[PDB]
Each structure stands twice: as structure tokens, then as C-alpha cells.
């Protein structure tokens, strides 16, 4: 059945649907837009549940009213919802319309303790998210950062108990860093970064510096210090001592730092997912995380952009499969991106390989037997972009006698706006939805398209770091079709 080949399509809501004052401003305008999405066959929508809005009043002071109103409207429209536990800042760069910083009471603490923020070698602090260095430091009026995220999700589960009961919310995406992604804020626009800069390492706050200092001493190398020859945000690999040919990144010291640096993210995600499993135990929802798509410099030996981000990915070291294996124990979904990008669309000087990157991440996930979903990186309204998404949603096409050989769990499109609703753009979008649905009409019963809806089970036993790292062994990705068999046109 083509219904077994049906992949659900979700649409990201406009930023600030619930404003910084914690008010659901334009119910009527959003409703008009949602009714049209529903008419296009869209399965559901996605929304950031901003930490900066909900717990703004003060510690453990949660106001869910406006959001409950938003969820009530989504339900009345007959759409499902993907909720992002957004523990990061919204916008923040010159040009961003909607700016939602993390809670002010947290920023106040930051004023007297600048090390709660991610920090570069030059000492600049990024206030968009709390460094992994304070995940377990009880410096937030008694609570650790992880306890903050844990109490937040629990209050959400309790206050949204009816919506979770009704099956409105189908999955909870746990924000794990800048832009909600599990990574270091290595390419900040606010600090001058410009594509395709290699970015900078962000492990200099006192907490991680002490962490690294203890780690090297145990390795019997107290003389090793954090990186000092990595260059800056906009440099290119070969112009640095760390990333150039036979540079520091290939030394015993370099490889130890990179392993230490990337492991912090694996554990950061594992610990926080543990709390999410506890918070949502028994609810009919799936957990998920967002992995960033660093496609620039993917084409060269150093993979510099990925390394400073926290993904220790090299020609001979799979830096992504270990993340998938970590997600295994939580039965979580790996939400990726760059689904609409083609290498031909990137400037050659960027040494960009989004197509190859998507293939590696998706293949890794499927090898670890977890679900993989994804989004488009940049706004696109053209057929060429949609065809690439459809290709990635079912790499080996449709299967006439059963579910597809390979297929993403779902796709979330960025982003709902009036431009998407313009006649020309919308008519192409409607075709994209149809194709993602394998030429079938919207279907309300997930069973019809192989999406088992079950109560969240407790996490499986902890997987030791060394076992997770066995997944760094290089493996050939699954073969991909060159062009999809379900083009929006022919």
C-alpha cells in the first residue's frame, strides 16, 4: 500500500506566536493560517516552548496559560503538535525580529558568575545557553542546570496532562544547546562569524577548564592545555596550526582534546534525556533531539567546522553514529537538517557536502535502529528544493510491496508564514505534501502508515562511553537514489 510509504509532514509555526509577554497575540490570524495548512493535508505543526517565556517570573514560577491556549487552538484545527523544550535564546542578532532571551533571573546570576555561559579563548561569553560545564553545579538558587530542565519538563507534563492524554502532542524535542541543537555555539553571528568560517572552540569557561585540567592530569599529561592554535571564527583550516595538514589535531594531545570535547556533548544529552524519560513516562509521545548540520569543510580531511561544533567527525572516525547509539537507550528520534540542500548550491570555497552529510547521519541512525526525522536548513519555495527533501525522506524510493526499504520518520518544514501561503508558493507546497504522502490524501490513523503510538517506556540500561565510541568505526552509508521517484512534477 502506498499508505505504508506515507511520511508525515509538519510545519514549524511563526516565531513568537506566544510573545515575550507570555501572550497568545493573534489567535484569529494564526487560525486562518492553520486552517489552510490542514486543507493542504499537513499532519501537524512544531513550536518552541520558550524557557525565557514560561519561567520568566522567577525560579519554579511557571505560567502555561498562553501556551495552553495555543495548544487548544491547534487541537481544534485537527493538527498534531511537536513541542520543543526550548532552553535557549530566540534570535539575538541584528535583524532578528523576535528576541526571547533565557530567563532574566538566570542572566542576573550570570552577571555575578560569567562562567555559566559558553566561552571562547578570547573570553567572550555567549548568553544564549548554559554551558555543559554547569549541568551538575548547584549554583542556580540551589538547583543545577539539569535540575532546571528536569523541573521544567515535569511541570509541562503536569500542566499539559490533558493534551498529552488526548494524543495532541506526538513528540517532545529536548533543546540541548544554541538554537536547541546538541552542539557548542561555535559559529556566532554576534561575534562576527561568517559562512564558511571554521568557527572557534567554546570550552573555556572555568568549569570545563577545570574538567579538562583534571582529565589530562589523570591521563598523566598535566602539561597539556586547551587549544591555542585554532585560529578564529572566519579563518580557513590550512591557515591554522590546529587544523592544517599534519597540524595539532592529529597529535596525541589533539586527539585527546577532541575526544574529551565531543564526549561532553554525548553525556550532556544522555543525562538530560534521562530526565525527559522520567518526566514523560507513560505518555503517548516520542522523545527527540536536534543535531546541527555543519556541511562546510565536510569535504576536507580536517572537518574543521564540525570539530569546533563538537562533532568529532573525520574521514576515518564516525562522529555521528555514537550520538545515535546514545539515543537508542531513550528510544528517541534523531532530528537532522539540510534535507533540501545540494552540493551544487554551495560556493566551492566552502568545501561543503550537505548531501554526503545527510547520508552519513541518516545511515548511522538506521544502523543503530533508531528513528530519524529532519528539516530543511534554509527557506525554500522551489520544486528543486522539495524534490531533494522527498529524496531524503525515502532514499531508495517507494516500495510497491510493503513499507519503504529506508525512510525518515517525518519531516518538519521551516517555516509557516504568509509568503508560503501566496498562491504560487502554496500550490507547489501542496504538491510536496502529496508526494511525501506517497500520492495519498491526508490520513488521521498513524497505524495506516506504520506509526505505532505507544506509552513512553523507561530508558534502557546505561551504555558505557567506550561502547558508545565503538560506533566511531567507519561504515559505508546506504546507497541513495540519484533522483527521487516521487518528484512534485514528473
From Swiss-Prot:
Annotated effect of mutating residue 337 to A: Reduces activity 1700-fold
Annotated active site: 181, 375
GO biological process: polysaccharide catabolic process
Keywords attached to this entry: Acetylation, Carbohydrate metabolism, Glycosidase, Hydrolase, Polysaccharide degradation
Pfam families xrefs: Glyco_hydro_14
Reactions that this protein is recorded to catalyse: Hydrolysis of (1->4)-alpha-D-glucosidic linkages in polysaccharides so as to remove successive maltose units from the non-reducing ends of the chains
Domain of life according to the entry: Eukaryota
One Gene Ontology term of the molecular function aspect: beta-amylase activity
Residues that hold substrate according to the record: 48, 88, 96, 290, 295, 337, 376-377, 415
EC numbers for this chain: 3.2.1.2
Outcome after substituting residue 337 to S: Reduces activity 360-fold
PANTHER family: BETA-AMYLASE 1, CHLOROPLASTIC, BETA-AMYLASE 6
Assembly and binders: Monomer.
Family per record: Belongs to the glycosyl hydrolase 14 family.
Name under which the protein is recorded: Beta-amylase
Organism per entry: Glycine max
Gene assigned in the entry: BMY1
